[PDB]
Amino acid sequence: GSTYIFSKGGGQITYKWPPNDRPSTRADRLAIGFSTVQKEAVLVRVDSSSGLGDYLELHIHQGKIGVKFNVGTDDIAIEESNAIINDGKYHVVRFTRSGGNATLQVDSWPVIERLAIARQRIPYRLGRVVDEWLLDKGRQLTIFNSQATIIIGGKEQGQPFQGQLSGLYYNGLKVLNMAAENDANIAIVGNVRLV
Ligand SMILES: *[C@@H]1O[C@H](CO[C@@H]2O[C@H](CO)[C@@H](O)[C@H](O)[C@@H]2O)[C@@H](O[C@@H]2O[C@H](CO)[C@@H](O)[C@H](O)[C@H]2NC(C)=O)[C@H](O)[C@H]1NC(C)=O
């Protein structure tokens, strides 16, 4: 609903949990709509408190949307490698995590149906789901500990997002809506504006 345009030079929307409600979770739900033409960008990153490795990162690499996270132990990647999503068009991404398991869903509305065939078409929903499962007898770690910041825009990774982000949802937090409503725990910097 609340859409922010990240213009030339990039920008950043930061949400800081009250230093005293910093959550630790077994499961996560993230949703965001986006449009971009970028080959590479970081869209959203949830980092833990200083001194901890835990993080969750939504990014685009080689035109493809994916999420990388760490919850103690190994870095875990889930990527949707069939859709090229950097076409300046709208897409919705949905990510869930349960311990080391993870699901990623990417919806798109292509207007083309393919010796491929350039057939202009009525746009239709094309959904892709990827599930990643780990099979140890509950052996690796499962908790994203002490979540401190949700940073939207990718500047801190040296990979700024340019284009449109909307409708961010994270564990009950409608972060871009809270930004729009001038939430005390949100800071906006750079070339970012509310549509
Ligand atoms: C992460 O996932 C494992 C495995 O999940 C199960 O295995 C298949 C993998 O494709 C999946 O399709 C099924 O939905 C199924 O849930 C979970 O561990 C398994 O589930 C139960 C406990 O709910 C155990 O009794 C099983 O023995 C165990 N299977 C194996 C092979 O280890 C695990 O709980 C889950 N992690 C979290 C935190 O949700």
Side-chain angles (χ1 to χ4, degrees), residues 55-68:
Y55 75 93
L56 171 75
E57 179 176 296
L58 177 67
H59 55 57
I60 295 162
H61 295 149
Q62 293 169 126
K64 290 137 191 190
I65 191 83
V67 176
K68 198 169 205 189

PDB file of all heavy atoms in Angstrom, residues 55-68:
ATOM      1  N   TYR A  55      21.553 -12.600  10.960  1.00  0.00           N
ATOM      2  CA  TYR A  55      21.009 -11.663   9.986  1.00  0.00           C
ATOM      3  C   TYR A  55      20.105 -12.388   9.006  1.00  0.00           C
ATOM      4  O   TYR A  55      20.135 -13.606   8.897  1.00  0.00           O
ATOM      5  CB  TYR A  55      22.128 -10.933   9.220  1.00  0.00           C
ATOM      6  CG  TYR A  55      22.823 -11.786   8.178  1.00  0.00           C
ATOM      7  CD1 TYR A  55      22.404 -11.785   6.839  1.00  0.00           C
ATOM      8  CD2 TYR A  55      23.897 -12.604   8.534  1.00  0.00           C
ATOM      9  CE1 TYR A  55      23.049 -12.582   5.880  1.00  0.00           C
ATOM     10  CE2 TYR A  55      24.542 -13.393   7.598  1.00  0.00           C
ATOM     11  CZ  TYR A  55      24.122 -13.382   6.279  1.00  0.00           C
ATOM     12  OH  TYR A  55      24.790 -14.188   5.377  1.00  0.00           O
ATOM     13  N   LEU A  56      19.300 -11.608   8.302  1.00  0.00           N
ATOM     14  CA  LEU A  56      18.401 -12.101   7.283  1.00  0.00           C
ATOM     15  C   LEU A  56      18.460 -11.059   6.176  1.00  0.00           C
ATOM     16  O   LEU A  56      18.262  -9.872   6.430  1.00  0.00           O
ATOM     17  CB  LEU A  56      16.986 -12.210   7.850  1.00  0.00           C
ATOM     18  CG  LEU A  56      15.831 -12.520   6.898  1.00  0.00           C
ATOM     19  CD1 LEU A  56      15.894 -13.969   6.519  1.00  0.00           C
ATOM     20  CD2 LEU A  56      14.490 -12.236   7.560  1.00  0.00           C
ATOM     21  N   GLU A  57      18.764 -11.488   4.960  1.00  0.00           N
ATOM     22  CA  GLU A  57      18.947 -10.542   3.866  1.00  0.00           C
ATOM     23  C   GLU A  57      18.154 -10.921   2.620  1.00  0.00           C
ATOM     24  O   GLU A  57      18.273 -12.039   2.111  1.00  0.00           O
ATOM     25  CB  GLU A  57      20.431 -10.403   3.525  1.00  0.00           C
ATOM     26  CG  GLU A  57      20.701  -9.457   2.391  1.00  0.00           C
ATOM     27  CD  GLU A  57      22.168  -9.273   2.131  1.00  0.00           C
ATOM     28  OE1 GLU A  57      22.882  -8.742   3.013  1.00  0.00           O
ATOM     29  OE2 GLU A  57      22.610  -9.648   1.024  1.00  0.00           O
ATOM     30  N   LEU A  58      17.345  -9.978   2.154  1.00  0.00           N
ATOM     31  CA  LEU A  58      16.606 -10.104   0.910  1.00  0.00           C
ATOM     32  C   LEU A  58      17.337  -9.255  -0.109  1.00  0.00           C
ATOM     33  O   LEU A  58      17.517  -8.043   0.075  1.00  0.00           O
ATOM     34  CB  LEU A  58      15.166  -9.615   1.072  1.00  0.00           C
ATOM     35  CG  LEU A  58      14.244  -9.593  -0.155  1.00  0.00           C
ATOM     36  CD1 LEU A  58      13.921 -10.997  -0.663  1.00  0.00           C
ATOM     37  CD2 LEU A  58      12.954  -8.831   0.155  1.00  0.00           C
ATOM     38  N   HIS A  59      17.778  -9.904  -1.178  1.00  0.00           N
ATOM     39  CA  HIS A  59      18.591  -9.243  -2.176  1.00  0.00           C
ATOM     40  C   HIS A  59      18.262  -9.758  -3.567  1.00  0.00           C
ATOM     41  O   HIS A  59      17.476 -10.704  -3.719  1.00  0.00           O
ATOM     42  CB  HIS A  59      20.091  -9.409  -1.855  1.00  0.00           C
ATOM     43  CG  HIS A  59      20.537 -10.832  -1.700  1.00  0.00           C
ATOM     44  ND1 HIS A  59      20.364 -11.782  -2.682  1.00  0.00           N
ATOM     45  CD2 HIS A  59      21.177 -11.458  -0.684  1.00  0.00           C
ATOM     46  CE1 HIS A  59      20.856 -12.939  -2.269  1.00  0.00           C
ATOM     47  NE2 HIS A  59      21.361 -12.767  -1.060  1.00  0.00           N
ATOM     48  N   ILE A  60      18.861  -9.125  -4.571  1.00  0.00           N
ATOM     49  CA  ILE A  60      18.774  -9.570  -5.946  1.00  0.00           C
ATOM     50  C   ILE A  60      20.197  -9.801  -6.444  1.00  0.00           C
ATOM     51  O   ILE A  60      21.040  -8.912  -6.318  1.00  0.00           O
ATOM     52  CB  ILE A  60      18.039  -8.526  -6.840  1.00  0.00           C
ATOM     53  CG1 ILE A  60      16.574  -8.387  -6.407  1.00  0.00           C
ATOM     54  CG2 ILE A  60      18.132  -8.910  -8.327  1.00  0.00           C
ATOM     55  CD1 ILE A  60      15.881  -7.128  -6.891  1.00  0.00           C
ATOM     56  N   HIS A  61      20.465 -11.003  -6.953  1.00  0.00           N
ATOM     57  CA  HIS A  61      21.744 -11.311  -7.582  1.00  0.00           C
ATOM     58  C   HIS A  61      21.486 -11.897  -8.963  1.00  0.00           C
ATOM     59  O   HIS A  61      20.644 -12.786  -9.126  1.00  0.00           O
ATOM     60  CB  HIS A  61      22.601 -12.252  -6.720  1.00  0.00           C
ATOM     61  CG  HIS A  61      23.033 -11.658  -5.411  1.00  0.00           C
ATOM     62  ND1 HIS A  61      23.226 -12.418  -4.276  1.00  0.00           N
ATOM     63  CD2 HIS A  61      23.298 -10.377  -5.051  1.00  0.00           C
ATOM     64  CE1 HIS A  61      23.594 -11.633  -3.277  1.00  0.00           C
ATOM     65  NE2 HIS A  61      23.640 -10.390  -3.721  1.00  0.00           N
ATOM     66  N   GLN A  62      22.197 -11.363  -9.958  1.00  0.00           N
ATOM     67  CA  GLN A  62      22.043 -11.742 -11.376  1.00  0.00           C
ATOM     68  C   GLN A  62      20.591 -11.720 -11.899  1.00  0.00           C
ATOM     69  O   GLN A  62      20.182 -12.601 -12.650  1.00  0.00           O
ATOM     70  CB  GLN A  62      22.715 -13.093 -11.653  1.00  0.00           C
ATOM     71  CG  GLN A  62      24.237 -13.067 -11.534  1.00  0.00           C
ATOM     72  CD  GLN A  62      24.867 -14.461 -11.542  1.00  0.00           C
ATOM     73  OE1 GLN A  62      25.765 -14.744 -12.345  1.00  0.00           O
ATOM     74  NE2 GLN A  62      24.402 -15.337 -10.644  1.00  0.00           N
ATOM     75  N   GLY A  63      19.820 -10.716 -11.496  1.00  0.00           N
ATOM     76  CA  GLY A  63      18.420 -10.605 -11.911  1.00  0.00           C
ATOM     77  C   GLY A  63      17.422 -11.450 -11.129  1.00  0.00           C
ATOM     78  O   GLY A  63      16.216 -11.399 -11.391  1.00  0.00           O
ATOM     79  N   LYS A  64      17.915 -12.215 -10.154  1.00  0.00           N
ATOM     80  CA  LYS A  64      17.078 -13.177  -9.436  1.00  0.00           C
ATOM     81  C   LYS A  64      16.968 -12.863  -7.961  1.00  0.00           C
ATOM     82  O   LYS A  64      17.965 -12.537  -7.314  1.00  0.00           O
ATOM     83  CB  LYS A  64      17.591 -14.593  -9.661  1.00  0.00           C
ATOM     84  CG  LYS A  64      17.358 -15.076 -11.093  1.00  0.00           C
ATOM     85  CD  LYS A  64      18.557 -15.807 -11.647  1.00  0.00           C
ATOM     86  CE  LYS A  64      18.391 -16.036 -13.138  1.00  0.00           C
ATOM     87  NZ  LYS A  64      19.433 -16.968 -13.668  1.00  0.00           N
ATOM     88  N   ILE A  65      15.743 -12.950  -7.446  1.00  0.00           N
ATOM     89  CA  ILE A  65      15.447 -12.642  -6.052  1.00  0.00           C
ATOM     90  C   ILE A  65      15.780 -13.833  -5.161  1.00  0.00           C
ATOM     91  O   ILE A  65      15.601 -14.983  -5.551  1.00  0.00           O
ATOM     92  CB  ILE A  65      13.965 -12.166  -5.859  1.00  0.00           C
ATOM     93  CG1 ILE A  65      13.728 -11.596  -4.451  1.00  0.00           C
ATOM     94  CG2 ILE A  65      12.985 -13.272  -6.147  1.00  0.00           C
ATOM     95  CD1 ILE A  65      14.132 -10.150  -4.294  1.00  0.00           C
ATOM     96  N   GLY A  66      16.296 -13.548  -3.973  1.00  0.00           N
ATOM     97  CA  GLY A  66      16.726 -14.587  -3.051  1.00  0.00           C
ATOM     98  C   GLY A  66      16.883 -14.021  -1.656  1.00  0.00           C
ATOM     99  O   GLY A  66      16.849 -12.802  -1.457  1.00  0.00           O
ATOM    100  N   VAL A  67      17.054 -14.913  -0.691  1.00  0.00           N
ATOM    101  CA  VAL A  67      17.226 -14.525   0.695  1.00  0.00           C
ATOM    102  C   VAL A  67      18.413 -15.287   1.257  1.00  0.00           C
ATOM    103  O   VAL A  67      18.567 -16.482   1.009  1.00  0.00           O
ATOM    104  CB  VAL A  67      15.970 -14.853   1.543  1.00  0.00           C
ATOM    105  CG1 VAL A  67      16.210 -14.538   2.995  1.00  0.00           C
ATOM    106  CG2 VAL A  67      14.764 -14.080   1.046  1.00  0.00           C
ATOM    107  N   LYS A  68      19.266 -14.594   2.000  1.00  0.00           N
ATOM    108  CA  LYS A  68      20.335 -15.271   2.710  1.00  0.00           C
ATOM    109  C   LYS A  68      20.210 -14.968   4.193  1.00  0.00           C
ATOM    110  O   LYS A  68      19.949 -13.832   4.577  1.00  0.00           O
ATOM    111  CB  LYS A  68      21.693 -14.842   2.165  1.00  0.00           C
ATOM    112  CG  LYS A  68      22.812 -15.786   2.526  1.00  0.00           C
ATOM    113  CD  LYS A  68      24.054 -15.447   1.742  1.00  0.00           C
ATOM    114  CE  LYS A  68      24.957 -16.656   1.589  1.00  0.00           C
ATOM    115  NZ  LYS A  68      26.277 -16.250   1.009  1.00  0.00           N
TER     116      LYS A  68
END
